[PDB]
Amino acid sequence: SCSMPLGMESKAISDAQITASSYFTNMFATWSPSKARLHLQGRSNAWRPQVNNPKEWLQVDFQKTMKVTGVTTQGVKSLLTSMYVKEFLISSSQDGHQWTLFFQNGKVKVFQGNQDSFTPVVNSLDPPLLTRYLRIHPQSWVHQIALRMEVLGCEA
Numbered sequence: 001s002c003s004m005p006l007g008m009e010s011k012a013i014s015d016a017q018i019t020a021s022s023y024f025t026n027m028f029a030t031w032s033p034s035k036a037r038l039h040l041q042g043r044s045n046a047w048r049p050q051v052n053n054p055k056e057w058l059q060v061d062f063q064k065t066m067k068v069t070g071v072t073t074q075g076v077k078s079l080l081t082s083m084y085v086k087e088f089l090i091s092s093s094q095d096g097h098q099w100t101l102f103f104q105n106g107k108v109k110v111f112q113g114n115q116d117s118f119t120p121v122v123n124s125l126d127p128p129l130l131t132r133y134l135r136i137h138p139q140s141w142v143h144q145i146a147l148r149m150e151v152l153g154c155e156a
Contacts, residue, residue: 002069008036008148018033020057023048029043031046047148058135058147060133061132067128068092068129069152069153069154070151071123073085073148074120074147075118076117076146078146085113087138087139088138088139090134091135092133092134094131136149
């Protein structure tokens with residue numbers, strides 16, 4: 001009863017609500033944070049950071065506190081090239097300035113992500129995370145960091 005998609009795919013979460021540490025742009029494509037939407041199609045249809053390293057992150061601002069019970073991630077296949085995140089961390093904030101890593105079994109939880117560029121993977125957050133802001137922190141990837149995502153949950 002608390003697993004509704006919050007609005008990445010539907011665009012109920014607007015472009016302005018999605019930001020990142022950096023993003024990759026060249027003459028071919030512009031992989032801006034607001035392209036990180038589950039199942040999005042087109043030339044520029046995922047977020048990619050400017051460099052591939054675990055210092056990079058993607059942020060969503062719900063604009064109020066929500067109850068988050070899962071995240072869904074997907075990579076992207078750009079032309080003939082596969083790109084996906086294999087493992088990631090999650091951090092959260094109410095105020096947008098002080099952040100907390102999501103913990104499980106005594107330590108920072110390393111979420112197991114994708115195994116291809118096109119199939120979604122759902123990761124449960126238990127206990128649920130009550131938060132206004134979410135950040136995803138890629139830790140390992142195939143070829144390049146690329147993400148499309150959805151957030152699952154309900155009202156706080």
